[PDB]
């Protein structure tokens, strides 16, 4: 009661201290400084490859390190590995549980991870003397549905769940070595830093927390949205990230300075964002919507540099290769397209 | 085409075989009947290993040469809005209820009632942007408890604006009308109502008839005669 009230007052005082310490540094805005630069031309990209073979909705995809192989997960209980240069199929892995929501591809190329709605993350081994693909081990311990997973190394993986918690795992043993707590709502996505020493995560409470892999202690918290956060990704520099929410708005955040940078909104679009991705040079920002179309934004001028319309259903996943050559789009019409 | 080497031809053959296996596996999965099962809790959802049997829980069974897959999603304890679209293509959502325990006003919250919540859930499920054109089949309860509970306690008057009292037929018909008059479509979605009995066979024939009727209606709407 009284102790609770005084603790709440102390927390509000700390919040005021944060609020008026953040506001001292906000001197200028990005747009008025960037207005000197010359705007990028109207980017128009064409469809080069059309990948077919799925029989249900496509929920996730991931690019390989060599930027020629990619894995896609779909609700018909299948996991297909593609050759993007010749449209051939390399592998097709049946799943024990049909419902999946995310997939990952190992940076070395030996393992593929999947999972969702069954609270179990499974690991598959691609290179066996047996000549098949077999599950290496199944990770258990989460309570809510799995929403994202990323291979930190060949023996480590970090996952986010619907139980409001993110956990790091040891693949060799199968036990959680670090647990991250603090999100009030459901965690929906995460992205790893290029140095694999930090990562972020977007939760349903319209906040994104910057974690620390080693010591397992949260460092910074970012706000500014008004609804659920569905997508997140790092800038190639490693000092900024962009978030996508369901309020038809994309925002850019800075790590070194705790301030808002940009807003990507248009009165013509009032639909939610499903996926967010960057480019090799960090110039143009790509975001998929549920209005059946994708959109290409200039990261420096917040203007639509082009459109990308080839799907008749909702776009669910996006991806850009490591060399920046191409870009892939997956949708609910069970078709994958490669644009250039 | 003819410019391929000896390796790429075998790669193409492998890809073609993978395609044919995928297609033949996906053909069989289209003739399965998927059922999504919902309930208020102890309203009889656990009564499956006896009635129809000799994370997300899934059970498989067959009847009169027809494959069934029932998904129990009542143990997820997560936000429904984030994963309810995963069942967009299901057939004949089943909404098991137990409203024979109405006069026993309990909520585990000290303020509400089982009946009111149950109707809130029924209205919430039936009127999504999804689940349109998806029929609902209702299982009410074992009627003996209602029989023995309405006779001793005329507590049914706790429901505002009711005329009759202490008549099982009238009260049951009133409750059924109350649920069946809650859907906001009433023109493109059908609701089937049944009363469960101890008999083991009587609880499966109804489901089989309802699903075959739904399939026939879907075929009529698909072949252009509708």
């Amino acid at each position: 009661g009284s102790e609770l009230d005084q603790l709440r007052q102390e927390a509000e005082q700390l919040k005021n201290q944060i609020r008026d310490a953040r506001k001292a540094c906000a001197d200028a805005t990005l747009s008025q400084i960037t207005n000197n630069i010359d705007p990028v031309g109207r980017i128009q990209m064409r469809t080069r490859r059309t990948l077919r073979g799925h029989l249900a909705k496509i929920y996730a995809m991931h690019w390989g390190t060599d930027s020629r192989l990619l894995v896609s997960a779909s609700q018909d209980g299948k996991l297909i590995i593609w050759d993007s240069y010749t449209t051939n199929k390399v592998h097709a892995i049946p799943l024990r549980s049909s419902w999946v929501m995310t997939c990952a591809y190992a940076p070395s190329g030996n393992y593929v991870a999947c999972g969702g709605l069954d609270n179990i993350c499974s690991i598959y081994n691609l290179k066996t003397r047996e000549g098949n693909v077999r599950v290496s081990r199944e990770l258990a311990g989460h309570t809510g549905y799995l929403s994202c997973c990323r291979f930190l190394d060949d023996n480590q993986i970090v996952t986010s769940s619907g139980d409001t918690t993110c956990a790091l795992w040891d693949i060799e043993t199968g036990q959680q070595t670090t647990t991250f707590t603090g999100h009030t709502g459901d965690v929906m996505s995460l992205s790893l830093a290029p140095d694999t020493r930090l990562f972020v995560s977007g939760a349903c409470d319209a906040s994104a927390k910057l974690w620390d892999v080693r010591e397992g202690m949260c460092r910074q918290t970012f706000t500014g949205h008004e609804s659920d956060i569905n997508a997140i990704c790092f800038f190639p520099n490693g000092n900024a990230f962009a978030t996508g929410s369901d309020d038809a708005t994309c925002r850019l955040f800075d790590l070194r300075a705790d301030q808002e940078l940009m807003t990507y909104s248009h009165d013509n679009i009032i639909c939610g964002i499903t996926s967010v991705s960057f480019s090799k040079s960090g110039r143009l920002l790509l975001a998929g919507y549920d209005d059946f179309n994708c959109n290409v934004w200039d990261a420096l001028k917040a203007d639509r540099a082009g459109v990308l319309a080839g799907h008749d259903n909702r776009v669910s996943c996006l991806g850009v290769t490591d060399d920046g050559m191409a870009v892939a789009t997956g949708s609910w019409d069970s078709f994958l397209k490669i644009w250039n | 085409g003819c410019t391929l080497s000896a390796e790429d031809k075998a790669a193409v053959e492998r890809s073609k075989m993978i395609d044919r296996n995928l297609r033949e596996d996906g053909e069989k999965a289209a003739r399965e009947v998927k059922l999504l099962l919902l309930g208020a809790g102890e309203s009889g959802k656990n009564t499956i290993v006896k009635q129809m049997k000799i994370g997300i829980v899934e059970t498989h069974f067959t009847f009169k040469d027809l494959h069934f897959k029932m998904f129990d999603v009542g143990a997820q304890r997560s936000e429904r809005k984030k994963w309810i679209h995963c069942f967009e293509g299901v057939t004949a959502i089943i909404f098991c209820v137990a409203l024979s325990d109405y006069d026993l006003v309990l909520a585990e919250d000290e303020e509400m009632n089982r009946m009111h919540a149950s109707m809130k859930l029924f209205d919430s499920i039936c009127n999504n942007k999804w689940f349109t054109d998806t029929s609902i089949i209702l299982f009410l309860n074992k009627k003996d408890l209602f029989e023995e509970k309405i006779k001793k306690s005329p507590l049914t008057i706790c429901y505002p604006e009711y005329a009759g009292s202490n008549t099982y037929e009238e009260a049951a018909a009133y409750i059924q009308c109350q649920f069946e008059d809650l859907n906001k479509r009433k023109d493109t979605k059908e609701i089937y109502t049944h009363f469960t009995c101890s008999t083991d066979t009587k609880n499966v024939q109804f489901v089989f008839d309802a699903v075959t009727d739904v399939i026939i209606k879907n075929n009529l709407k698909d072949c252009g005669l509708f």
Partner: single-chain antibody
Amino acid sequence: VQLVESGGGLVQPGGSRKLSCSASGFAFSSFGMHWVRQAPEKGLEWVAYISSGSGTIYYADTVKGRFTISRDDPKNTLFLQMTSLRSEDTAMYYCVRSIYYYGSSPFDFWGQGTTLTVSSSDIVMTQATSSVPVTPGESVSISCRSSKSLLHSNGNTYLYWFLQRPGQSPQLLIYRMSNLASGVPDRFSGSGSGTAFTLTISRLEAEDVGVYYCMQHLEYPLTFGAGTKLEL
């Protein structure tokens, strides 16, 4: 993984048998199979190949229209049937296992093999050296040459290096002349450009003595190479 052949023995010119091969320890029905001739005190020679799912069967012109190769998937057995046998059919028959997709390594497992004695344009098969007196503790360079460039516009060169040791079956060393096989020591390395090829062994020890072969996979009439026998 294991591969045991059956049906050997001694035959006559007016004779016919049905070789057998049993595969255990791996998914048999998702692999291509080969047969390789190997005459006594002579080099290797490709014979036949059946694809996965029996979708494709190729033969050699030397024995075209004379041998039949079949596949038995549920019982995991393979057969080769012979109608007429000349004097030049005495050899050391082997069964080879290969799988083709992006990044795979065919001809990885050569099987134990079996023996059978019979009673008495194409790419060229050429190598410069025939024998090399070597002493452990230094480097060895082996060369192999062809008549046509093995390089495609996509960028793959199909040259396979592998070794045979006395008293046991050959095993793969290098595939596509750039990559080491699984479980092969890093001492070996391969390189080339166009038609010129070389194979270097950084450190030599007592277990690296035997006969070396070079093979091209550019066209389906697979031609082996001469042997470069190394003597301790």
